């Protein structure tokens, strides 16, 4: 969906779109999608653009441009969501968390997890590293 982004990327993206829009229609050419992304720091090579117009005629409207930035931002955020989700598990932050620490903080997180689900969770996997916890979460 598009609720993954806050207000403040969307108000910035309409700021970039209405700056280089042609006549206020909400239209840009297949050149201007390149210059509107390099105006904000993001510098993709032309293969990254080449698939998105194939994924959406020559008229790139503002809901089409908003959906392409949402997929361009969510893939790196879905790859990096899980490390900061791992940070409250260990006290130091290198990735090493105790097994005795993990049965009171993971049964109390608010998804109605009982004592039985985290007991299945850790014995289908001392202290375990960080990259194994992605290996055991995504499965």
Partner 1 sequence: XXXXXXXXXXXXXXXXXXXXXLLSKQRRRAVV
Strand partners, 127: 98
Backbone φ and ψ for 69, nearest 5 degrees, come out as -75, -25
CB of 97 to partner 1, least distance (A): 15
Angle at 24 between CA 20 and CA 53, to 5 degrees: 60
Nearest CA to 103 out of 95, 92, 114 is that of 114
Task: Considering only the stretches 5-13, 24-32, 65-73, 112-120, report the one whose residues sit in contact with partner 1 under the rule CB under 8 A.
Answer: 112-120
Q: Does 137 bind partner 1 (CB under 8 A)?
A: yes
- The 115-134 contact track toward partner 1, x by CB under 8 A, reads --x--xx--x----------
Contacting positions for partner 1 (CB under 8 A) = 81-82, 85, 109, 111, 113, 117, 120-121, 124, 137-139
């Amino acid at each position: 969906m598009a609720d993954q982004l806050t207000e403040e990327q969307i108000a910035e993206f309409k700021e970039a779109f209405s700056l280089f829009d042609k006549d206020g229609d909400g239209t840009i050419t297949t050149k201007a999608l390149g210059t509107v992304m390099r105006s904000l720091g993001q510098n993709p090579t032309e293969a990254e653009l080449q698939d998105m117009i194939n994924e959406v005629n020559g008229t790139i409207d503002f809901p089409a441009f908003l959906t392409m930035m949402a997929r361009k931002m969510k893939d790196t955020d879905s790859e990096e969501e899980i490390r900061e989700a791992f940070r409250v598990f260990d006290k130091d932050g290198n990735g090493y968390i105790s097994a005795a620490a993990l049965r009171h903080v993971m049964t109390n997180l608010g998804e109605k997890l009982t004592d039985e689900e985290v007991d299945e969770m850790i014995r289908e996997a001392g202290q375990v590293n960080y990259e194994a916890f992605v290996q055991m979460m995504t499965a």
